[PDB]
């Protein structure tokens with residue numbers, strides 16, 4: 001769910017997930033996908049595609065378990081859809097952290113700017 | 122769309138929407154709902170619950186017409202969804218203005234992963 005996602009983002013990146021990734025480039029946020037603007041944006045693209053692959057479980061609503069043991073995210077067994085959901089979110093948290101070096105606040109928006117069409121997932 | 126909403130917030134509250142409310146508390150902005158921190162946040166909770174009742178239009182993307190007449194938001198859509206959407210937005214802008222008295226600037230970029238579970242709408 002958004003809950004786990006937001007938390008994982010904060011645990012990995014150390015950044016306020018809404019503030020840093022709630023409206024960033026073409027893919028981080030709640031405005032679907034678009035041609036990634038940079039590596040961080042690109043994490044969000046893969047994440048949104050990760051979500052498309054899920055079957056049945058609700059990526060926004062459905063809670064799942066993960067542990068943060070040794071400051072690494074391990075997705076709990078869950079059921080397959082929830083485990084995969086979790087893996088999607090873990091992936092994007094990790095990728096965002098990984099790409100903090102090129103994170104660029106100029107891609108943050110209030111209203112979403114220009115985004116060419118993303119490739120189909 | 123976020124454009125009309127933000128315009129309304131500005132008109133009602135006289136504050137930059139993105140800054141003041143774009144990430145406020147547990148409900149204003151991107152992390153879905155959490156338990157409202159305060160009255161401002163609870164406006165945003167109600168707003169999100171309002172958006173849930175909308176059939177067949179998109180709050181994030183869909184433009185709609187409204188007028189600001191004698192400093193009053195007046196929704197002007199023929200389209201039943203866009204009219205209802207407009208009303209959700211008007212309602213939050215008015216609410217935000219109404220609770221400017223308790224606006225807690227420390228919630229402005231509240232860390233949403235701290236939020237407790239929201240009650241259902």
Ligand SMILES: [Li+]
Nearest residue numbers: 193194195211
């Ligand atoms: Li009114």
